[PDB]
Amino acid sequence: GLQRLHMLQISYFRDPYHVWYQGNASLGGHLTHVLEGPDTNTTIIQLQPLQEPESWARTQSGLQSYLLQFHGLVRLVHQERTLAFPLTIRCFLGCELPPEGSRAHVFFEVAVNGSSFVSFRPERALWQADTQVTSGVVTFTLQQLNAYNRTRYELREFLEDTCVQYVQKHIS
Amino acid sequence: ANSFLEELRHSSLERECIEEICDFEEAKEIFQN
Ligand SMILES: CCCCCCCCCCCCCCCCCCCC(=O)O[C@H](COC(=O)CCCCCCCCCCCCCC)COP(=O)(O)OCCN
Ligand SMILES: *[C@@H]1O[C@H](CO)[C@@H](O)[C@H](O)[C@H]1NC(C)=O
Ligand SMILES: *[C@@H]1O[C@H](CO)[C@@H](O)[C@H](O)[C@H]1NC(C)=O
Ligand SMILES: *[C@H]1O[C@H](CO)[C@@H](O)[C@H](O)[C@H]1NC(C)=O
Ligand SMILES: [Ca+2]
Ligand SMILES: [Ca+2]
Ligand SMILES: [Ca+2]
Ligand SMILES: [Ca+2]
Ligand SMILES: [Ca+2]
Ligand SMILES: [Mg+2]
Ligand SMILES: [Mg+2]
Numbered sequence: 757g758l759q760r761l762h763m764l765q766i767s768y769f770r771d772p773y774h775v776w777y778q779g780n781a782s783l784g785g786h787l788t789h790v791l792e793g794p795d796t797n798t799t800i801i802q803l804q805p806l807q808e809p810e811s812w813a814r815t816q817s818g819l820q821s822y823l824l825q826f827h828g829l830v831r832l833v834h835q836e837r838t839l840a841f842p843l844t845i846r847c848f849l850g851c852e853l854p855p856e857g858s859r860a861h862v863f864f865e866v867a868v869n870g871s872s873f874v875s876f877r878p879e880r881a882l883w884q885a886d887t888q889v890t891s892g893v894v895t896f897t898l899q900q901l902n903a904y905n906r907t908r909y910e911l912r913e914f915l916e917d918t919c920v921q922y923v924q925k926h927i928s
Numbered sequence: 929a930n931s932f933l934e935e936l937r938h939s940s941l942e943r944e945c946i947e948e949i950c951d952f953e954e955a956k957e958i959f960q961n
Contacts (some may be wrong), residue, residue, distance in 0.1 A: 828933050836935065905934040 760784060762850035765791065767826070769839045772834045772846055775827055783849055783927050790818070800873045806926045829900065839897045849876075851919035860923075862915035874898060878915060881908040930954070 765779035777798050779791040788806065794797045800816050807815060826847075829845060833839060849864035864876040865886070872886035872928040885894050901907045929948035937943075944950045959961045 825933065828936055831933050832933065903930060904933045 757855050758852055758854075759923050759927050760850055760852040761919050762848070765826075766846040767830075767845045767847075769830065769841055769843050769845070770849075772839070775830075777823060783885050783923065795823065798823055825906075832895050832900065833893060837892045839893065845873075846870075849915065851915050851922060851923060853923055860916055860920045862912075862919065864911065865917065874901070876911065876915075878912050880914045883907075 761781060761783055763781040765777060768776045768778075770776075775795045777791060777795070779792060780787060781789040787803060789800070789802050789880075791798060791800045798820070798821050805812075818865050830839070830845070834841075845863065846867045847918065848867075850862065852861045853859070862876075862878050866873045866875065866892060874885050874894065876881050883898055885898060887894065929944070929950065939954070941958050944954050945958065
């Protein structure tokens with residue numbers, strides 16, 4: 757049946773320079789990982805040892821790079837367009853492998869202050885607004901996300917490649 | 929021109945508009961007028 761890895765990240769920004777993160781991931785309905793801490797010291801844990809020490813440390817390294825880049829982008833939208841703080845952002849993302857064997861379905865949705873904001877469309881690796889309220893913030897955030905390899909193709913690859921291999925290896 | 933997270937670097941006429949092509953908003957972020 758539908759094998760899947762889901763990841764959840766909630767980021768509470770007191771101001772542009774300080775964030776508290778809280779997240780987790782699950783394989784099907786089983787909780788597998790938790791993430792929590794200030795930007796300066798975010799703890800990332802696999803609740804069971806699904807990955808051996810070296811391979812886990814490589815995952816942890818990529819996640820910590822991601823968190824600094826995510827914080828960077830939020831700081832950049834503030835510096836360029838002004839955001840109102842405090843604000844909370846929720847990213848919910850994952851990969852889902854159909855039993856029939858068609859291509860994995862992936863997603864990466866961002867909400868701000870509990871409302872839909874933008875989400876990723878993996879067919880052409882582009883982000884779109886989920887809200888119909890137009891604003892300089894949404895326009896600029898989409899311009900940035902759709903401008904770079906990192907936030908388009910590397911992001912797609914994490915979902916369709918890294919996430920899918922992890923599902924195939926660790927459930928089975 | 930912009931590359932991923934380059935815009936957190938201070939603006940630079942040389943880096944941005946002479947070594948690369950800059951758009952009007954990148955130029956204005958240098959002029960600070
Ligand atoms: C899949 C197996 C992995 C192992 C299992 C994971 C263990 C989970 C443990 C923790 C719980 C999960 C919570 C965190 C979610 C992590 C998501 C990480 C994705 C990631 O690293 O993306 C990299 C791109 O990042 C970027 O592009 C950086 C910025 C991305 C922007 C995101 C959108 C935010 C919008 C904010 C804008 C401003 C808002 C204005 C109010 C590309 O992945 P890769 O580096 O692995 O490379 C792959 C290609 N080779
Ligand atoms: C999973 O993460 C989100 C953090 O935003 C949270 O709301 C949900 O409570 C978390 N689950 C657990 C079991 O901590
Ligand atoms: C998010 O909500 C907070 C707390 O209610 C508010 O002060 C802030 O202006 C909001 N920020 C947004 C919508 O970007
Ligand atoms: C995307 O990033 C830069 C474009 O500025 C380039 O060095 C790189 O080759 C591009 N990616 C691919 C796979 O071509
Ligand atoms: Ca540049
Ligand atoms: Ca620039
Ligand atoms: Ca600039
Ligand atoms: Ca350059
Ligand atoms: Ca700029
Ligand atoms: Mg500007
Ligand atoms: Mg030069």
